[PDB]
Amino acid sequence: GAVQLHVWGPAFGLPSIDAECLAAIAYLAQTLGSADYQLIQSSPSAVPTQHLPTLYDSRTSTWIGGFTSITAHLHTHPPPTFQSTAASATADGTAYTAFLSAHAAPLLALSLYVSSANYGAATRPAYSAVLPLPLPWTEPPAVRAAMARRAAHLGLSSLDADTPEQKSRIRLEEAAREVLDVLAEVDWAAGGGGRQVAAEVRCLAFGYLALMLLPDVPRPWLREIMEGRYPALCTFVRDFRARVFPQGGKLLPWADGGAQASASASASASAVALRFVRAVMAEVPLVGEWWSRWWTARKKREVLASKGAKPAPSNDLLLLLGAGLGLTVVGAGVFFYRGLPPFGEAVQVWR
Amino acid sequence: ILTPASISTLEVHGATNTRRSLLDQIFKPVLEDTAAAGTTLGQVLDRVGAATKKLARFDIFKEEGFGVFLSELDISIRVKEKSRLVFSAGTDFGNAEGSAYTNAVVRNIFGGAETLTVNASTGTRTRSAYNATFSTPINGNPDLRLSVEALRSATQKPWASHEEHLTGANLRLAWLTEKGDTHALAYSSVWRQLTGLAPTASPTVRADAGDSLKSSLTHTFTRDRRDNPMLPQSGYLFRSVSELAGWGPLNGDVSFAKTEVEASGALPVAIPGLAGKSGVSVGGGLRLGVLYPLPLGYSLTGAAQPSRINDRFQLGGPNDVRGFKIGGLGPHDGVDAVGGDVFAAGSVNALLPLPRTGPDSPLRLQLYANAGRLVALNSKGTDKEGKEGLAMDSAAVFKGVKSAVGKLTNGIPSLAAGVGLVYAHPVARFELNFSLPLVLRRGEEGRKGLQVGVGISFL
Amino acid sequence: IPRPLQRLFDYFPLRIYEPNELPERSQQLTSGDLPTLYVFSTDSDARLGLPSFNPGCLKWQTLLRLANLDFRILPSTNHSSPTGSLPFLLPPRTSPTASPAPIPASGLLSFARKNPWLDLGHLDADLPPRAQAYLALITHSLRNAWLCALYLDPTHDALLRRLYVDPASSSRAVRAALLHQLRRAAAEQVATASSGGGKIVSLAPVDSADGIDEEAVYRSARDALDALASLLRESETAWFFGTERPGSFDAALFSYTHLMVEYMSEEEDTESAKGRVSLGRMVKEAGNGELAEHRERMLGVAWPEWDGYRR
Numbered sequence A: 001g002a003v004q005l006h007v008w009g010p011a012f013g014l015p016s017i018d019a020e021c022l023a024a025i026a027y028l029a030q031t032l033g034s035a036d037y038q039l040i041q042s043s044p045s046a047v048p049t050q051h052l053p054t055l056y057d058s059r060t061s062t063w064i065g066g067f068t069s070i071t072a073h074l075h076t077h078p079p080p081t082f083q084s085t086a087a088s089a090t091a092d093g094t095a096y097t098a099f100l101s102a103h104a105a106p107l108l109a110l111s112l113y114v115s116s117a118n119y120g121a122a123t124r125p126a127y128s129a130v131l132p133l134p135l136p137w138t139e140p141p142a143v144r145a146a147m148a149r150r151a152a153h154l155g156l157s158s159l160d161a162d163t164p165e166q167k168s169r170i171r172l173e174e175a176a177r178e179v180l181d182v183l184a185e186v187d188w189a190a191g192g193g194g195r196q197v198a199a200e201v202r203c204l205a206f207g208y209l210a211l212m213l214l215p216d217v218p219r220p221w222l223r224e225i226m227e228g229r230y231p232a233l234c235t236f237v238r239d240f241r242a243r244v245f246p247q248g249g250k251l252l253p254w255a256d257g258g259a260q261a262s263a264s265a266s267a268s269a270s271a272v273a274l275r276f277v278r279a280v281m282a283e284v285p286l287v288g289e290w291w292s293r294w295w296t297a298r299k300k301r302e303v304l305a306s307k308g309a310k311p312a313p314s315n316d317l318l319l320l321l322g323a324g325l326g327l328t329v330v331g332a333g334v335f336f337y338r339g340l341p342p343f344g345e346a347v348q349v350w351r
Numbered sequence B: 001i002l003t004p005a006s007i008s009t010l011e012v013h014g015a016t017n018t019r020r021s022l023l024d025q026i027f028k029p030v031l032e033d034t035a036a037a038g039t040t041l042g043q044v045l046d047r048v049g050a051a052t053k054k055l056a057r058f059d060i061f062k063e064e065g066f067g068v069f070l071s072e073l074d075i076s077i078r079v080k081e082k083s084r085l086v087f088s089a090g091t092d093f094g095n096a097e098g099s100a101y102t103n104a105v106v107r108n109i110f111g112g113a114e115t116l117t118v119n120a121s122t123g124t125r126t127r128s129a130y131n132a133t134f135s136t137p138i139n140g141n142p143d144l145r146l147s148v149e150a151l152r153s154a155t156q157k158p159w160a161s162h163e164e165h166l167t168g169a170n171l172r173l174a175w176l177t178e179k180g181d182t183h184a185l186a187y188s189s190v191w192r193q194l195t196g197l198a199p200t201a202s203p204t205v206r207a208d209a210g211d212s213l214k215s216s217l218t219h220t221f222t223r224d225r226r227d228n229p230m231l232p233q234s235g236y237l238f239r240s241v242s243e244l245a246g247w248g249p250l251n252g253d254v255s256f257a258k259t260e261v262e263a264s265g266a267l268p269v270a271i272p273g274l275a276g277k278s279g280v281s282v283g284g285g286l287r288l289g290v291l292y293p294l295p296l297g298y299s300l301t302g303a304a305q306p307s308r309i310n311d312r313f314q315l316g317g318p319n320d321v322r323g324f325k326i327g328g329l330g331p332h333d334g335v336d337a338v339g340g341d342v343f344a345a346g347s348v349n350a351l352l353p354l355p356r357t358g359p360d361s362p363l364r365l366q367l368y369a370n371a372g373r374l375v376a377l378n379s380k381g382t383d384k385e386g387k388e389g390l391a392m393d394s395a396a397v398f399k400g401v402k403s404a405v406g407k408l409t410n411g412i413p414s415l416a417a418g419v420g421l422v423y424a425h426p427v428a429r430f431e432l433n434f435s436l437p438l439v440l441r442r443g444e445e446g447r448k449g450l451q452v453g454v455g456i457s458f459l
Numbered sequence C: 001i002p003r004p005l006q007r008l009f010d011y012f013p014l015r016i017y018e019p020n021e022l023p024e025r026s027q028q029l030t031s032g033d034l035p036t037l038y039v040f041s042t043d044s045d046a047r048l049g050l051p052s053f054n055p056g057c058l059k060w061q062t063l064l065r066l067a068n069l070d071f072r073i074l075p076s077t078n079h080s081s082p083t084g085s086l087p088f089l090l091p092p093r094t095s096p097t098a099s100p101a102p103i104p105a106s107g108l109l110s111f112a113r114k115n116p117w118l119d120l121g122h123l124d125a126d127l128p129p130r131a132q133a134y135l136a137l138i139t140h141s142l143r144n145a146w147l148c149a150l151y152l153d154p155t156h157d158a159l160l161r162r163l164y165v166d167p168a169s170s171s172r173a174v175r176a177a178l179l180h181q182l183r184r185a186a187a188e189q190v191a192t193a194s195s196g197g198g199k200i201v202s203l204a205p206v207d208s209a210d211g212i213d214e215e216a217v218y219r220s221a222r223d224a225l226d227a228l229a230s231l232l233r234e235s236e237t238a239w240f241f242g243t244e245r246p247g248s249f250d251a252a253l254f255s256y257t258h259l260m261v262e263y264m265s266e267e268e269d270t271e272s273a274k275g276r277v278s279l280g281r282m283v284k285e286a287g288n289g290e291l292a293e294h295r296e297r298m299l300g301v302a303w304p305e306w307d308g309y310r311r
């Protein structure tokens, strides 16, 4: 276990429920050895990077967040057992990597998160099945809200995601066609013909595409469009899953010999309570906005310190002293205003 | 009555929260009045009654139970204090547009008549209005009052197809003279922001959209000699509002010297056949205003920026020259109602009582002949504008104001006449009239149908 | 009731005068003989029609200059926009008191086609499926780098204050509020970017520089610039996709490369101490300098008269 990848729990018959986390798992399986890495089921509040997937390089005790950063870090610091128009292929991979993170992600949000009918039947139960008991009431609301903001520019809403229906389906088909048309040219199957992309881009493409096809949903508009109009992309996803992730990725080196047992390492009674209360604190009006910002900056320094940098110390001591002064003046005012004799008397006499 | 008998020792009930210093500054001169010892009941009995109203001005005591007792010559006065908190979370009627008013009030803080009123409002034409005010008398004088107010409101301007966001603080020094006038010197530093432009917004509104700060020192003088402010049937009213912004020590994005006056009056007429109060009166009104651009600095000579839509005057409406849409007078860019720099509005009405109804009733019939003008300053008079625009020298501004004032005299002013009924409700005046525009300029909006107006100020 | 009243209501008013003249400020700005494109610029720059410092406004300004349309530019703010954001176009007044409806950014190309000064198909032609992927390198990878460096980076604090908050108001209090809002807004966008954001902290979006990975944003821009240089190297012409004239793709890239060289090209002394290459230097060093020549060629077509574009 040279490195440990913190990802979401398995769902929909896939090793992870997140497109980026699933891509990171696929990249490690093909390149890294079986015993070199470990998969740990986690949540954004469990890792100091506040982002999933997150890699913890135990060799240097470094926290790396994001799929692009994880792949870049591995190339610069290859593990002992690592096996990853030449410039055109590299340039194409960069272009499609940015395209997937910018246009494929909002499309996936509409099918799973923005659609209230779809979210409440498949996505929401899946998230609760991979979290300790008090968390599904705080984390999925945050994930859905962030994912809904990603698909905000798409222009569609929950009502559209399913005569009102005579053009509602047209917008859904048009939005899916724009994203899927670009991806169909790449020919991710690595067969004869078509463009050629790096291994990292192929893993990222599968992560987004698998979450639009495999999940069984009450409103499978995306699955019908993908199968009906793009058989080549549907074939690629099934073939990739059947090889990289047989029987739903049960041979992956999950920590503690299981997907759910892996999360128990950082899901103790105290740790879970601390994660839950922090989420509640951020919702307190006019103070959460300030607690989360303080907490985000505190965790940012922790990640930067792990990377080898030397962040400047903060002024937390000054705020602590300043907070104490605020209590003293408030307490003095209460002690003075309350408990003092009345300013005037009931009977006032002048000679 | 004429018997000399000094009051000497006196005692006041119900002063358990107000400091003795507040009462000492009010009742000590009453004691010194008894030193004359000549016709006391003709001189000190009126003095206590005169000074009784001084206590009611602090608003700390309940005016309902303001009883006064008599004895021998000790004088006992019994008063009751108001509630220390009054969360008057209610709506508004007279100010119908006033929508709701969750006015919370902390009264009598620190013993003196201090008051922290944290009002909050939300309704039509005003998305939100949060006001925090702290008022306190100076040197124990109820007439002289000092107030510090912080506000953050987002008003709406449908006539100009935009909304204004206000954020600033004010420092007011209100004063009531012995004659009855009300001086008020206030310093304001607000941050105006024009946002929420309508799709039909004129280019003038778009050009003026943005952020600006106004640091101004304004003085208000009011002399209300009318018998009834809601239904003026006798007396007169003179109000003058002068504001200086951005000049000298005041720093801001706007620099001007705005002055607005207003003179009203009413003359009762008596029917020879009828006896007593006939109820028929003939009134009038006249409002003037000048907006003079000024440079930024301590010099009166220099380049001055033209006025913006935030500061320009707006004329027309039920509280303005009637017969026209709200802001229906002055320059109009397309459909938006841009403001003007100078204006002059007049009114000639005649209140009449309805038949078979006593004159004491608030209901009256009014026939008005409201008229007004509103022009905007421009640099057409100057020979040639420099390369860097929006910068008029002292000569150009002075010539522009003279031309603007001269535009008022030539040509018939925008005139509308009509009849209607007026309700003199004490909180606010309600008026419903049938108007008919007679003379107006092209692009101005006049209403020929029924017009409903409610408020405290009318022309 | 309506019919008897209508025959009398048209009698009034009796006298109608000419409309009142508009204010001086309105008469000096809104009056003109050419369509005015409102962009983020300075008073001196707008006089010569120099490129705007806003990448969003520069993209549309460049396209209008490639469409031979005769127009002028005037500095403005996002509040005056018909869509809530610049740029936008106001056609010249037909009457001193009446003006046509404003043209939004989306309709800019349609307006330029109706007022020749033609065949503007290349300026708005649909891109091939492969070219759509490379477009995401500009609208997402390069945009986040510009937003992070201009707003979140304390190094460009003086530039950000001078470009945006200084002309807004002279009040030191309002300027501070505006700076806070600008940085908070930029942080929300750079956060909706799997390149360097994606952190989940609460039910509200991340609006601070501490919730954004600067290294990931910087690395994505460096990869994007190399990829875009390779794509241009494939073309046999001086433009993308082997076109004889610049199109929408070139204007989209020029709106970022020009501003990076003009403003973000700092001195090597600061970069050496910081250990990070500036945005302007990466543009010149991308590939074999292909992106540097493209910016100069794009300037030499849309702004042939300008000669102070070095930095």
Ligand SMILES: CC(C)[C@@H](C)/C=C/[C@@H](C)[C@H]1CC[C@H]2C3=CC=C4C[C@@H](O)CC[C@]4(C)[C@H]3CC[C@]12C
Residues within 6 Å of the ligand: A133, A134
């Ligand atoms: C949301 C606010 C009101 C906070 C303060 C309230 C928290 C309480 C009510 C919640 C938070 C965590 C919850 C909790 C966590 C885990 C379990 C284990 C389960 O086998 C029995 C219920 C139990 C014990 C529940 C009971 C209700 C608890 C204790």
Ligand SMILES: CC(C)[C@@H](C)/C=C/[C@@H](C)[C@H]1CC[C@H]2C3=CC=C4C[C@@H](O)CC[C@]4(C)[C@H]3CC[C@]12C
Residues within 6 Å of the ligand: A134, A137, A138, A283
């Ligand atoms: C006993 C277990 C098995 C389950 C059924 C019980 C759940 C109840 C009793 C408790 C457990 C967790 C609690 C819970 C968690 C978190 C929040 C978020 C907070 O902002 C509102 C209250 C809310 C939503 C509370 C409500 C009460 C819940 C839902």
Ligand SMILES: CC(C)[C@@H](C)/C=C/[C@@H](C)[C@H]1CC[C@H]2C3=CC=C4C[C@@H](O)CC[C@]4(C)[C@H]3CC[C@]12C
Residues within 6 Å of the ligand: A134, A269, A272, A273, A276, A277
């Ligand atoms: C004695 C404890 C350690 C045992 C019962 C452990 C309980 C577990 C299930 C944890 C999981 C979530 C925890 C939890 C969630 C949130 C809160 C709200 C806080 O305001 C009081 C504690 C409380 C209620 C704690 C108590 C301990 C809980 C319920």
Ligand SMILES: CC(C)[C@@H](C)/C=C/[C@@H](C)[C@H]1CC[C@H]2C3=CC=C4C[C@@H](O)CC[C@]4(C)[C@H]3CC[C@]12C
Residues within 6 Å of the ligand: B234, B235, B236, B264, B265, B266, B267, B282, B283, B284, B285, B348
């Ligand atoms: C009667 C005494 C007490 C003295 C002091 C009061 C005088 C004032 C209140 C009276 C005297 C003459 C009145 C007067 C005369 C003529 C007119 C013209 C009319 O179109 C409007 C009202 C107006 C302007 C009224 C207003 C009220 C005035 C000015």
Ligand SMILES: CC(C)[C@@H](C)/C=C/[C@@H](C)[C@H]1CC[C@H]2C3=CC=C4C[C@@H](O)CC[C@]4(C)[C@H]3CC[C@]12C
Residues within 6 Å of the ligand: B185, B217, B218, B219, B242, B243, B244
């Ligand atoms: C609006 C700007 C120009 C500010 C500075 C206004 C200043 C003038 C108009 C104000 C400032 C102080 C005021 C002032 C001070 C004191 C008194 C004594 C009182 O018995 C009569 C009024 C009088 C004389 C008033 C008149 C109006 C004055 C002179």
Ligand SMILES: CC(C)[C@@H](C)/C=C/[C@@H](C)[C@H]1CC[C@H]2C3=CC=C4C[C@@H](O)CC[C@]4(C)[C@H]3CC[C@]12C
Residues within 6 Å of the ligand: B236, B237, B263, B264, B265, B283, B284, B285, B286, B347
């Ligand atoms: C239609 C408008 C023009 C009407 C309301 C006019 C109002 C003004 C002109 C009236 C209102 C109050 C009047 C006023 C009040 C009191 C007095 C005292 C008296 O000893 C001399 C006249 C004098 C000074 C008059 C002059 C005229 C005034 C100032």
Ligand SMILES: CC(C)[C@@H](C)/C=C/[C@@H](C)[C@H]1CC[C@H]2C3=CC=C4C[C@@H](O)CC[C@]4(C)[C@H]3CC[C@]12C
Residues within 6 Å of the ligand: none
């Ligand atoms: C008090 C006695 C001794 C004498 C002098 C007073 C006479 C009054 C009735 C006279 C004196 C000045 C007159 C006066 C002055 C100016 C104007 C302004 C004009 O637009 C309306 C009439 C009005 C308002 C008249 C009304 C009648 C007034 C007020």
Ligand SMILES: CC(C)[C@@H](C)/C=C/[C@@H](C)[C@H]1CC[C@H]2C3=CC=C4C[C@@H](O)CC[C@]4(C)[C@H]3CC[C@]12C
Residues within 6 Å of the ligand: B345, B346, B347, B348, B369, B370, B371, B372, B412, B413, B415
């Ligand atoms: C503001 C109030 C007082 C209302 C009544 C306004 C009245 C004034 C402005 C009106 C009333 C009568 C009008 C009047 C009567 C008759 C004529 C003859 C015409 O060939 C030129 C205009 C002229 C001279 C106009 C000018 C405007 C006047 C003088």
Ligand SMILES: CC(C)[C@@H](C)/C=C/[C@@H](C)[C@H]1CC[C@H]2C3=CC=C4C[C@@H](O)CC[C@]4(C)[C@H]3CC[C@]12C
Residues within 6 Å of the ligand: B257, B259, B292, B300, B301, B394, B395, B398
């Ligand atoms: C430049 C030279 C040639 C001459 C014409 C200019 C003189 C200036 C300095 C004078 C002329 C008119 C004056 C002027 C007119 C009117 C007012 C309104 C008043 O409430 C405040 C002062 C103010 C604003 C003054 C300020 C000084 C001005 C502007």
Ligand SMILES: CC(C)[C@@H](C)/C=C/[C@@H](C)[C@H]1CC[C@H]2C3=CC=C4C[C@@H](O)CC[C@]4(C)[C@H]3CC[C@]12C
Residues within 6 Å of the ligand: B348, B369, B412, B415, B417, B438, B439, C014, C015
């Ligand atoms: C002031 C009261 C007592 C009464 C008499 C006034 C009535 C007003 C409404 C009447 C009287 C004279 C009328 C008047 C006179 C002359 C003209 C010239 C004409 O080309 C336009 C209408 C106009 C301007 C009208 C408008 C309405 C006026 C001004």
Ligand SMILES: CC(C)[C@@H](C)/C=C\[C@@H](C)[C@H]1CC[C@H]2C3=CC=C4C[C@@H](O)CC[C@]4(C)[C@H]3CC[C@]12C
Residues within 6 Å of the ligand: A280, A283, A284, A285
């Ligand atoms: C120190 C205490 C007294 C401070 C933090 C105030 C309140 C405490 C009790 C906390 C505990 C649970 C919090 C709480 C739970 C859930 C929600 C739902 C959310 O949609 C609005 C805020 C709200 C309603 C917050 C408000 C603040 C509460 C009620």
Ligand SMILES: CC(C)[C@@H](C)/C=C\[C@@H](C)[C@H]1CC[C@H]2C3=CC=C4C[C@@H](O)CC[C@]4(C)[C@H]3CC[C@]12C
Residues within 6 Å of the ligand: B286, B287, B344, B345, B346, B347, B371, B372, B373, B408, B409, B410, B411, B412, B413
């Ligand atoms: C408060 C104001 C708006 C009231 C009193 C109305 C009018 C005032 C301004 C007076 C002042 C000068 C007057 C005036 C001057 C000269 C003429 C030229 C003549 O051929 C028509 C009437 C006309 C145009 C009149 C109309 C009434 C005017 C415009």
